[PDB]
């Protein structure tokens, strides 16, 4: 069992990848590499403010969003809408999956089932 | 895998910065393939207090290792 082979099965679905910065990437997912290198397409990077007034946020990730090139210049919040982002795998903390997909079809490892039938 | 190329730095005084702040200077006696290094008569440069007769440093924590001698 490697859950990366689970995650490769998704391949056309709106996910939200929450990275270790705090930045969250919402978008249609294309392929996933065997090191969890997500490639999303129609993405909407955003950085959630912490709802308490005095607390700032990540400052480095503010710089990273502006420097992507996609921040809307009139925009109030840190959002950056950009076609084609590519994400190196060690950055992903968690991936918010869609509500609709059935886990009990997808989590069946074909290779584990293959060996277990064979042996 | 491959041992680092420090055959020319053996038995010479050397200053390396452990982590990002500490600076340790000693005589290089041996090295490993992780760039662990053991140097005699170390001192921690700031007054600077000596460490001990024989120390080893985990090369995870070494950044750079310039040599304060001939080579």
């Amino acid at each position: 069992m490697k859950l990366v082979n689970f995650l490769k099965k998704l391949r056309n679905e709106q996910v939200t990848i929450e990275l270790k910065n705090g930045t969250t990437v919402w978008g249609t997912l294309q392929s996933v590499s065997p090191q969890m290198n997500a490639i999303l397409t129609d993405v909407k990077l955003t950085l959630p403010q912490p709802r308490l007034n005095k607390l700032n946020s990540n400052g480095i990730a503010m710089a990273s969003l502006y420097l992507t090139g996609g921040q809307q210049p009139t925009a109030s919040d840190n959002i950056a809408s950009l076609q084609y982002i590519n994400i190196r795998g060690n950055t992903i903390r968690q991936i918010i999956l869609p509500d609709s997909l059935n886990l009990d079809s997808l989590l069946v490892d074909q290779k584990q089932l293959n060996s277990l039938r064979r042996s | 895998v491959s041992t680092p190329e420090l055959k020319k730095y053996m038995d010479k005084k050397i200053l390396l910065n452990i982590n990002g702040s500490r600076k340790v200077a000693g005589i290089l006696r041996g090295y490993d393939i992780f760039l662990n290094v053991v140097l005699d008569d170390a001192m921690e440069i700031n007054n600077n207090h000596q460490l001990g007769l024989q120390t080893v440093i985990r090369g995870n924590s070494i950044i750079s290792l310039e040599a304060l001698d001939a080579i």
Binding site: - | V1, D32, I33, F34
Partner: protein, 147 residues
């Protein structure tokens, strides 16, 4: 071998009296080990060699309780290679007897007088020549310590 962590485990596993321990490595240089890298390698050393025995042996020499029959064992190893390559260098001198070439015993192979000092220095810094040099001066030092 592959990942570095696996490579160390072999070294530390090797860190952690004569039935399963070779004597020639423990006295000095095991002559199995010395030209195993080059083409004249007879093969692998069949008796096991450890670093822990070498540290224990340095402890035993440093305390002073040396046991010389071990050195007689090592000398019994050296005599074979010394006499065999001495026969073979006389074979080389016979071939050189029977474009200037000379035969160097201390590598046991051919050189020329025409070549300059730096190429000849390159040949003199070899696995074969240095294994031979440690072998030979250790042999003559053991012989003069016997006499």
């Amino acid at each position: 071998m592959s990942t570095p962590a696996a490579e160390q485990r072999k070294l530390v596993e090797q860190l952690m009296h004569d039935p399963k321990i070779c004597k020639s490595y423990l006295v000095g240089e095991c002559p199995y080990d010395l030209f195993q890298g080059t083409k004249q390698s007879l093969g692998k050393c069949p008796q096991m060699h450890l670093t822990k025995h070498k540290i224990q042996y340095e402890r035993e020499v440093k305390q002073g309780k040396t046991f010389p029959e071990f050195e007689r064992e090592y000398l019994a190893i050296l005599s074979r290679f010394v006499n065999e390559c001495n026969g073979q260098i006389s074979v080389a001198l016979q071939n050189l007897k029977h474009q200037k070439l000379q035969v160097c015993e201390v590598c046991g192979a051919y050189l020329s007088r025409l070549d300059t000092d730096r190429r000849l220095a390159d040949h003199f810094l070899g696995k074969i020549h240095l294994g031979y040099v440690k072998m030979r001066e250790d042999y003559d030092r053991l012989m003069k310590n016997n006499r």
